[model samples]
Target: LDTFQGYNCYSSALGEYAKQKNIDQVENIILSQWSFFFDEEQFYKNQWYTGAADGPVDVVLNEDLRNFANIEVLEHISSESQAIDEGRKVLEKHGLQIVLMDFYYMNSFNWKSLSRFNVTREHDPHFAVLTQINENSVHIIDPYYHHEENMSMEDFIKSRNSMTKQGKISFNSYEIFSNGTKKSNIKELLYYRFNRYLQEKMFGKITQFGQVVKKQLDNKDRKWAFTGYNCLNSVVYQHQNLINLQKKFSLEMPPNLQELLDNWALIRKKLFEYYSRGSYNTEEISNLICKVASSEEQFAQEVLKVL
Candidate 1:
């Protein structure tokens, strides 16, 4: 529970789902979608960014890309129902998906408090996942609960609605994560994230991955380098972990690619060591991040050629 980010319940919900599905390297596959941080000793000498400091964040919510809104931001705004419906499509592509309710009334119909975090504060309409809805009950796999539970249909209806004028549960503007979760090796996540990466690069504001070294050479801005590095590093790590999982099961990764990735592991070590030393060499770190990032993308393009 302490490890869980109360704010990132949506991915946590999906992470929970992936866990139940028995997915391999759940962190690299699921959490890597969000995990990143930068401690800039060379700058203000503090942790400059903890992406998911909110326990962390979805890399999709890039600072250079757009505003990071809370998952529960849609309350009584009216344009909120689409995520629930769209989320259904994303999850259905994998397996038995829960019908996600983006937002739900969180008063009396809410749980007696199992997860502790959900009850701490009242959200607009909280995110929840429905697994089974029978004549008698509405089954939910709420991450706050750290497990699934059932809400009686009547209770669900009341909570699902609100104390509106006719606040009766009409089931109209409900929301999901109200949310989404992606699978390991799942293309949707890449689309979800890379789409943002594409848009961020459109105006040349966000740092370019291939140019990390050159940018550091002239500009000496670690922020730009860190952003690009973390982003591609997250994706590359996912690819590497997934490949390893397959090997455990068994990729004929070319020797060249294998050596590059192995070298990346060493440099990855060097980055942490540099952080420990508080030496904070942006040029060196950028070289390490950019080189690996370039190779990762080349391999990504090769895989892209197949599909």
Candidate 2:
């Protein structure tokens, strides 16, 4: 949500209006209305350059290349030329017959410019340019959320604060801290938060969910099944505990990727059958699940081949 600047702006406005008006209407309607007029081109322009924050791969592989890739070095925060020169030294030491050098001029606000930082006149150019003689010989390893110049610490904090204030993103409590027996449900709220965090952290990101699913269904590997199963198991385990506490206290279990895909197919079949024949094709429910599961299995196998 913090990453989505335009959406946050619109959501904040709607939230403020709703609060002032004392109107408790669903917020999704406002969100959907904004989506209806969203400019696809502008959206791409705003978000295209934004990449993931450093991932696990970057953490493990970037130590030796830190000099060249360091945000401080790129920003010229340190005057030590040796720090910048280490990369070329490594390339030459390997006798790899390569030339590595920095290229491209940029500033705090924009891309390459002819003016230097200390250029004459009243212009205070805020960026520097390094020319990479040969791109193939010298590749820049980009391994940050976004280039340091693209986003500042101030902007990030501002965005986060703005999003939190709007309630677009929030913290949840788990029931463990609540005392259900004492008439107050503080413990229950704590438990709810704990479970919500667990579920969202595991499956809220599509890539996270897809990766685990691909591992299990595509590879047909039970070891990978542990990843998806563990995620679903957490939700079920919490629900089971709640069920034991009280018969009426039932919580819905979240289905795993494979189960979701299977269920979606069943829903589609039921909808089609109901519309065409005035009733449901009850037999297709199980058949749809099996068919979808089989397709998912095959797709996983194909994906594994590439990996």
Candidate 3:
């Protein structure tokens, strides 16, 4: 449990260095594509709490990167405590000094309070402070499993190895350079690693969160159960991650997936718009489910077809 002390080696400064390398590499990736701005506004605005309220959240039904977060977290750490300690320990041990901070649920506050929430919770919350940790120096505990930040990675991996002898941590790999900047294939290798991850975690099952929800809708009656903030926030978080990947890779989305995502967004837009207006209906519910399911199926199939 105390293994997190290894963070003495995980300097936030190294992390910032890697992050900047990633940014610089990505910036030159495709001169045709615009560099992304992870400004405070864009970051929060794209989240489910606000994105759903402002309009339809962008749904990426067909890409591995679209719902990558869900697949990784759900597959790796079943316990929040384990995830936190391990993630913190691993990063710190690697010299990343970043402290594991509080995990903030995007929907923890009311959508209407976005402005004040940022001000009041601004410096007090994890993300705000983590953001200030010299970009090259700090690492935040994954917000999705805020509680896990306290868990130790070394201990968890040891336990997993003890039990199954095959323990895999979330985000198990780091980007390293070979040869030189001139011949670095980090991006391509990263994509391959991601594909291997999907095959291992979601080989038979659908990879996209949209598809998972859709299957639930189709199998059950229109009666759905998103349960709590985590359930709903999970899907929204994956969507945001897809946006991040899109920005990072500077790759154009496949046409088929793009269409499916568009359809998912249309329904999501209607659902949120109705939720805000206090007029959700059975018809609207059915529409949302159908679109979600279909989009998810399409996404799963597309990856299988390509890879």
Candidate 4:
């Protein structure tokens, strides 16, 4: 039922984990918590990636924020007993639910092209929780097809090797915990989180790049400015578009932070309205993007001050 993109499943997995832990504002948290980043190879210079909407939401699940949550990758799978034994140890030791990331959904599950945004190997991706082993199956809780999926070991290995477009895949489980462990003052960790966010040079460059998009729009290059380098999508799916930040997570953000959100929300909305719908009103919308970038700077400066 959810139109999850390539990186979005990870966010959903992380977000769903938080919700079951009794966290509120789950939607806001998924869209607000961010870790700004860049690598020359993944995204070349001057190109920007949006936060909150994609994979980076993993930032919110770190030990500093959710002290009780312990996530680990399963390894050394020489035999079925070892996998089960180790998985059991983590579940009992940490007293947490273990969730597995699998590609089985694409082969036999009922998600049915869950999302077209980031399809790999002509198929979509999915996440499910570890219901049990001996059944050698897991619950494909992407919210549909609640029946137990009995995957044979040969089926398991076959499903596991489907990673590449050229060849196969694997199902890896990570243990999650909520067994009475807690210690992060959300406010404190959020501060560290945003500070770390602003500290990234690319975020500022993206803001700069955003204004450049507006400038190019002003100069009369429409499609390239709006669509190239995936800027429009980046502008739309951001933490700033929401209404004044994560009070849903129990803290009202500073006014500057609120301004940061308001500005981008306006920019993304207007950019899409004009670019796609076609009044092509560059004058006002361009100025709004400029203003959005300015708001980004103000929040960046304020956070950097505390740093």
Q: Give the whole-model CA lDDT for all candidates, comma-separated.
A: 0.40, 0.26, 0.31, 0.43
Which tens-of-lDDT digit does each residue in 77-125 have in candidate 4?
2343355565456546543333433454434333234322332333223
Where does model 1 exceed 4 Å of error?
1-13, 21-55, 59-237, 244-260, 278-282
Give lDDT tens digits, candidate 1, residues 1-307: 2222222444555455545565433333343242323333322321222222221223343321222222221222222344334434545554334332423432323334422233333223334556554667756666644455677766655555453321233333222231433333444333443344334332121123224334444453334333332223433354454455446533334345466557555655554444334455656765665565555444444533432
Candidates sorted by TM-score, best first: 4, 1, 3, 2
Model 1: colliding residue pairs: 52-56, 52-57, 101-175, 101-176, 102-175, 102-176, 102-178, 103-175, 176-179, 246-250
RMSD of each: 12.8, 23.4, 13.5, 7.7
- Locate the minimum summed-lDDT window of 10 residues in model 3: 1-10
Candidate 2 lDDT, 27-70, residue by residue in tens: 22222110001122322222111111111111211221222222
lDDT-based ranking, best first?
A: 4, 1, 3, 2
Model 2 CA lDDT for position 75? 14
- The lDDT of model 3 is 0.31
- Winner of 1 and 3 under TM-score: 1
Q: Give the total clashing residue pairs for model 1.
A: 10
Clashes of each: 10, 24, 24, 10
* lDDT: worst 10-residue window of model 2: 169-178
Model 4: worst 10 consecutive residues (lDDT sum):
39-48
Of models 1 and 4, which has the larger lDDT? 4
How many pairs in model 3 have backbone atoms within 3 A of each other, for residues 3 or more apart or on separate chains, i.e. clashes? 24
Q: State which candidate has the highest TM-score.
A: 4
Q: Between the candidate structures 2 and 3, which one is better when assessed by TM-score? A: 3
